[PDB]
Design a protein around this ligand. Structure first.
Ligand SMILES: [Zn+2]
Ligand SMILES: [Zn+2]
Lengths: 37, 224, 52, 136, 60
RNA sequence: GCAGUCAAGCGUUCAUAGCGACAUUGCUUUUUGAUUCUUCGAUGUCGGCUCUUCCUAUCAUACCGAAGCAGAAUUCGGUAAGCGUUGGAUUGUUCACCCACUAAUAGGGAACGUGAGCUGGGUUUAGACCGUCGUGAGACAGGUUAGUUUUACCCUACUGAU
C-alpha cells in the first residue's frame, strides 16, 4: 500500500518496489551510453 | 502545510531539525532560506533554537522530544544544555540520558501520547521516557527495521512508514498508536522518511525533491 | 527593457570587429593588415561572425 | 570530498590503506570489504593512498551474497582502529576497521548499522546517521 | 571544561592526556596512560592491582 | 615524428567554426636504414629502483581570443614550462593492454642520463631437456631450467668543518 510517488495514482506492493512500472519504463533509463548502430 | 527546503544542499530535514507542537530545533548552518521555511508559518509561541549538540549538526537523530520533554544523549555538554535551557520554555524538562544508543531520534518515534521505541533499550531508560515525555511505550520494530524514529515519521494526527511495511504490520501499529498510517515515501523514493522530513500538527517540511504525489499523501495523512 | 539603440552602441565594441585568420587577434573593421608582429602583419583577415 | 558529503572534515590519521580488508557493518549481506582505491586521494610516487574515518572509497566484496561480489562499488568507513585526535585533544580508537556500502551520492544500500559509528562520519553523511543507532 | 575519570585506575584525567577506546559493544573506556591502557589489553583485573582505586576501596 | 603554402571536396544551401585531396618547401636526432670515421694490449652491454637538472612540440593549473560559444559543457587558438603529472593486475620487459583514483594522469634529453650507485628477471660461456635440421660431431637469432657482478685510502667536483 504505497503510491507511485512520480505520477501518484498506482498502488503497488510492499515486496520492495519503487515508482509505477509505466513511470520507470518511460522516465528511467539504464541502457544509456551505447550507440544502437 | 508542507514546505520544501534544503539545509545546505541536503534534502534531509529530520536529520538537522526536531519539530514539536510547542518548540523546534535547528542546526547553526546558515541558509536563512532554511530558517525562514520554519519562521514563516509559525508564531512566537513556538521558539526556534539554533544549537549543535555534541558538537554535531545531526540533532534530529541524536535527540527525541515531545511537547513536554526532551531527551538528549550523554555526549552533549553543559554549555549546550544551558543554551537550550535558557532558550526553551520551562514547560519541558530536559534530561541527559546515560545509555548506549546515542542516536535517540533513530531509536524513538515519539509524540504526545505514544512512543515507538527500539527493542534493546534499557528498562531504566524506557521508564525515564515515560516519566519525562509522559508517554506510553511500545517496543517491536517498523517492518524488521528496528530504527523506528528513522523509518517512521509520526504525529498525534497522523503517521507515516516506509514502503516495506506489511498491511498486517500497518493494521497492528495503527491500532497500537491509535492514529491512521499509510506507507509511502519522500524525496523521490527515499525509504528513510523519519529523517527525510519533519512534521508537526499544522506543519511539515521536506526536501525540494519531495514531489507533489508525495506532498499529497503528506497533506492527507497529517492534517487529520 | 532592451533599448535597441544601446544594443547597437554595444555592438561597436564586442560585435563590430574583425579577426585575423592566423593569430585570431581582434582588429578594427576598417583594417588593412594585422597589427601584431608575430603573425606577420598578414593581409589575410576575416570578419567576425555575429549571426548563427 | 564532496561526493555527496555535506561539509568539510578535519584531518584524521590515515589508518587503512589499499589492500585493506575491513568488516562490513550493514545488513547488505556483505561480510567484508577489500579497499582498492580512495576518493580525494593525493598522488605521490610510491605512496599508496589511504582512507580515514568518514572517507569514501572504492571497494570490492570478498565474502557474502554472490550477487554482490566480483564488482566494484563505493563504500564509506565508519570505524577504524588507528588512533586519531579530535580537536578537543583526546585520542580514540575502535577495535575494528569497519565500513558500509553506499551509492556514489551518499545513500546507503542497507537499512541499519550494527555497532558504533564515528561522529566524524555521521555529521558528514546524514543517511549514515539515519541508519545508525550508536554514535560513539 | 569538564574532567573525566579513568575506567581502570579511577584517576582524574585532565584535557589533552590519554587515549580512549570504544569497544564493539560501544562501552567506552578512557585511559590516563599507556600503563592502564595495556593492563586492560592484558585482561588484568583492577581489583587485583594494588595501586588502583578499586583495589584500595575494596581493601578499605 | 612534427610543422608551413596550395585545399578537390565533406562540414543543415553557408571552400578552413572544424576534418580532409593532389602535391609542394622543410625541421629535429628524441626513430629505422647507410656509412665504417673514433674504441679490438678493458669506454663493463637490456630493463627496473634511486636522484637531480634542462627543453617545449602544454595533459592539468593561471590569464586572454574565436567558435552551428543562451546557460552549462566542449573544441580550436595565443603567450606561458612557474608548480605538478599517480597507485596497481599480467609481462624480464622498453612498448603495450586493463582496473581505479585524480586538477592531470603530456612528450622528450643529459655517452639511447645513471652497474668502484643497487639488482640480475633477460640477453650472452660451460651443465641438462624437447622440437626441427643433419649420416655424424654438432646448429637454431626456437622454447625451458640452473648459473661468482670485484677496488676508492688518490686528484677534482660536491656536501659539511677548521
Ligand atoms: Zn507511475
Ligand atoms: Zn596576425
Amino acid at each position: 500500500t504505497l503510491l507511485c510517488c512520480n505520477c501518484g495514482t498506482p498502488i503497488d506492493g510492499s515486496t520492495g518496489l519503487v515508482m509505477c512500472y509505466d513511470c520507470i519504463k518511460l522516465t528511467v533509463d539504464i541502457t544509456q551510453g551505447i550507440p544502437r548502430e | 502545510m508542507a514546505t520544501r527546503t534544503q539545509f545546505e544542499n541536503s534534502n534531509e530535514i529530520g536529520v538537522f531539525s526536531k519539530l514539536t507542537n510547542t518548540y523546534c530545533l535547528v542546526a547553526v548552518g546558515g541558509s536563512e532560506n532554511f530558517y525562514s521555511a520554519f519562521e514563516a508559518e509559525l508564531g512566537d509561541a513556538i521558539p526556534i533554537v539554533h544549537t549543535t549538540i555534541a558538537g554535531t549538526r545531526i540533532i534530529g537523530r541524536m535527540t527525541a522530544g515531545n511537547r513536554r520533554g526532551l531527551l538528549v544523549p550523554t555526549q552533549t555538554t553543559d554549555q549546550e544544555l544551558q543554551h537550550l535551557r535558557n532558550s526553551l520554555p520551562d514547560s519541558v524538562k530536559i534530561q541527559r540520558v546515560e545509555e548506549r544508543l546515542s542516536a535517540l531520534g533513530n531509536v524513538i518515534c515519539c509524540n504526545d501520547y505514544v512512543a515507538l521505541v527500539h527493542p534493546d533499550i534499557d528498562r531504566e531508560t524506557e521508564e525515564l521516557i515515560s516519566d519525562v515525555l509522559g508517554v506510553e511505550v511500545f517496543r517491536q520494530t517498523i517492518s524488521g527495521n528496528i530504527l523506528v524514529g528513522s523509518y517512521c515519521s509520526l504525529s498525534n494526527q497522523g503517521g507515516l512508514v516506509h514502503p516495506q511495511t506489511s498491511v498486517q504490520d500497518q493494521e497492528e501499529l495503527s491500532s497500537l498508536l491509535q492514529v491512521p498510517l499509510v506507507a509511502g515515501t519522500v524525496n523521490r523514493g527515499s525509504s528513510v522518511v523519519g529523517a527525510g522530513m519533519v512534521v508537526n500538527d499544522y506543519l511539515a517540511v521536506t526536501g525540494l525533491d519531495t514531489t507533489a504525489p508525495e506532498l499529497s499523501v503528506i497533506e492527507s495523512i497529517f492534517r487529520l | 527593457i532592451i533599448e535597441p539603440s544601446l544594443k547597437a552602441l554595444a555592438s561597436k565594441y564586442n560585435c563590430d570587429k574583425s579577426v585575423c585568420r592566423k593569430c585570431y587577434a581582434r582588429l578594427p573593421p576598417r583594417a588593412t593588415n594585422c597589427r601584431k608582429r608575430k603573425c606577420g602583419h598578414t593581409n589575410q583577415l576575416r570578419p567576425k561572425k555575429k549571426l548563427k | 570530498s564532496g561526493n555527496g558529503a555535506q561539509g568539510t572534515k578535519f584531518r584524521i590519521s590515515l589508518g587503512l590503506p589499499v589492500g585493506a580488508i575491513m568488516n562490513c557493518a550493514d545488513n547488505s549481506g556483505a561480510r567484508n570489504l577489500y579497499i582498492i582505491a580512495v576518493k580525494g586521494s593525493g598522488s605521490r610516487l610510491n605512496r599508496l593512498p589511504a582512507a580515514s574515518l568518514g572517507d569514501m572509497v572504492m571497494a570490492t566484496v570478498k565474502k557474502g551474497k554472490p550477487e554482490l561480489r566480483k564488482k566494484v562499488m563505493p563504500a564509506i568507513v565508519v570505524r577504524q582502529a588507528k588512533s586519531w585526535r579530535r580537536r578537543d585533544g583526546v585520542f580514540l580508537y575502535f577495535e575494528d576497521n569497519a565500513g558500509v556500502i553506499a551509492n556514489p551520492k551518499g545513500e546507503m544500500k542497507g537499512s541499519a548499522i550494527t555497532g558504533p559509528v564515528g561522529k566524524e562520519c555521521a555529521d558528514l553523511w546524514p543517511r549514515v546517521a539515519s541508519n545508525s543507532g550508536v554514535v560513539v | 571544561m569538564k574532567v573525566e575519570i579513568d575506567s581502570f585506575s579511577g584517576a582524574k584525567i585532565y584535557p589533552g592526556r590519554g587515549t580512549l577506546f570504544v569497544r564493539g559493544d560501544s562501552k567506552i573506556f578512557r585511559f590516563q596512560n599507556s600503563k592502564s591502557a595495556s593492563l586492560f589489553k592484558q585482561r588484568k583485573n583492577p581489583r587485583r592491582i594494588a595501586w588502583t582505586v578499586l583495589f584500595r576501596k575494596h581493601h578499605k
